[PDB]
Symmetry: D2
Subunit: 182 residues, 4 copies
């Protein structure tokens, strides 16, 4: 029954505290930066002309927090990504989403994971460094379908019927895409 065995877990528990503390800080920047991209991209729902303006704005915020993922990547020790990966999972997914929509609005195709990683400045695999997880990518893409679902509908409201129709096609391919999996 030694307090001695609780004594030297005073230093571990204390240091883990402070690791999780800094991870939480950098992660909360990226949240804030992201959020302002996400808010601007909202305008597509009401002013159609604004797309180019919002995509350039989004694009710039992404690059602003590709830098933060650099700082984050060095606070994560060794091979212990999935110990803390909880703290940046949601954020990463919203970003995948943002990029995917930006690239759809620009060129009308689905961004590959590789590119999302490249734009964010992260790796394609576990091995060579702080990476971008397939499940995250897939879940971000999944948000996309739901967002364009809304956009297909506001396009009819803003009487751009032809566009609304295309959106629908694309969402169709995402759904077939997903059923390949289930």
């Amino acid at each position: 029954v030694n307090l001695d065995i609780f004594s030297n877990y005073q230093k571990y528990i204390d240091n883990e505290q402070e690791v999780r503390e800094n991870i939480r800080i950098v992660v909360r920047e990226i949240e804030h930066l992201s959020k302002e991209a996400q808010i601007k991209l909202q305008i597509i729902h009401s002013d159609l002309s604004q797309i180019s303006a919002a995509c350039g704005l989004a694009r710039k915020q992404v690059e602003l927090c590709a830098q933060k993922y650099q700082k984050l990547a060095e606070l994560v020790p060794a091979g212990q990504y999935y110990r803390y990966s909880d703290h940046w999972t949601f954020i990463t997914q919203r970003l995948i989403f943002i990029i995917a929509l930006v690239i759809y609005l620009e060129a009308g195709f689905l961004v590959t994971r590789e590119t999302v990683a490249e734009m964010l400045g992260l790796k394609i695999s576990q091995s060579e460094g702080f990476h971008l997880d397939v499940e995250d990518y897939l879940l971000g893409i999944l948000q996309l379908a739901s967002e364009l679902s809304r956009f297909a509908t506001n396009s009819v409201t803003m009487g751009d019927y032809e566009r609304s129709l295309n959106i629908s096609h694309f969402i169709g391919d995402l759904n077939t895409g997903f059923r390949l999996l289930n």
Copy 2:
């Protein structure tokens, strides 16, 4: 410490297990008749010509479980509707949904709470008898707007571009309706 205020609670906790249980049996059937109505309504996504036949069979279930909500209404005592409502909330919502989908397919307008009641054999207000809550109505409709979002897409996949565009107008208007609520 008296082992008797405990003896006179096991006779209550027993009695309650029975009420709660009989409530469960009835719902489990409503649970079952609706799932079959909803499973048939599935087809509208793949073979547009089945709409009529599907709407027939849905409308037949709905009334076959307006009857079950009968037996259910005579198992809830006094004014304890809300003490057990947890047991049939989600079930009711899905029905509102089915009915609402059904009338939409048929006449292309949004059902009123007032009718979903009539069709089910429930009262509009608490007073009168077993009733249909305004909150459960709106989440029923919230669900429809999501299911229509899907159909509007699959409509593009089956090449009924004209129809897809209509569903969107409607979804469009439902959103205006919800916005007016916060």
Copy 3:
């Protein structure tokens, strides 16, 4: 699609926000008077001589919020007790607990539901008026058995071996009481 069944629901959803909100204000105070009663009852763990003084101050809060359950009872309409009970369940349970701890410290026997009512200014049964549910009583007691488990230990830490042994007899009997329930 009618934007008016939506206009006549915002007047309901408003009215409900108000009921729900005023229910919240009253509880938040009961929430506050109890936490202070419970925060004082803390001392029994560290300085056994304070028991009397603590029990005094607890018994003073309890009655100071038998009054608040007054104002609360005139905000719940009709027989919608269970529609809102979610707002005061956890609060009530902690009170039952405090009172039950209080009478135990004083006379060393288990209070009956019947008294916790009287002390609070609630009725035994649904009929009569705003009431004290049998389930909330038992979880109140379940809590006491956990809090006594602690005290029984701290009693060993302050060297009142005789007392520690008594608390255990009591906890012992409460378990027999609960076992008789499943």
Copy 4:
């Protein structure tokens, strides 16, 4: 919009399925084995003489599933413990608990993490192999306090007062132990 990008995630999603599948199988053995240790150790609450019999029984089950953790440890790839660590976290914690109680019943002191690891045949650190996590250890020990809380009380019921008193002392040291942390 390529199905081609969903096509080659057919093989990853498929392989991860099957990894998680086998991890889930070995993990479910250890659950079953554990459980029967946990069930036998229950007798301490009623027949005091049985301790030696239960501790030997527990001890044998532990060694039986130190072997399974061997099989599990090779199904976990590379440095990806914390990817799957969710599947065996609870199980590990119950085991720490079991060992800790077995060693308390035998010799009356608190098992160090090192020993629990040694008995289970796992490592003390991240680095040199499949390991036993400090937080798990700590949470298992935490179960212990709650279990002995019950045991302190049944000892009074079986009129072994002197023992009940010791238990309480020990629980006291666990609590002081924990507050060093909070």
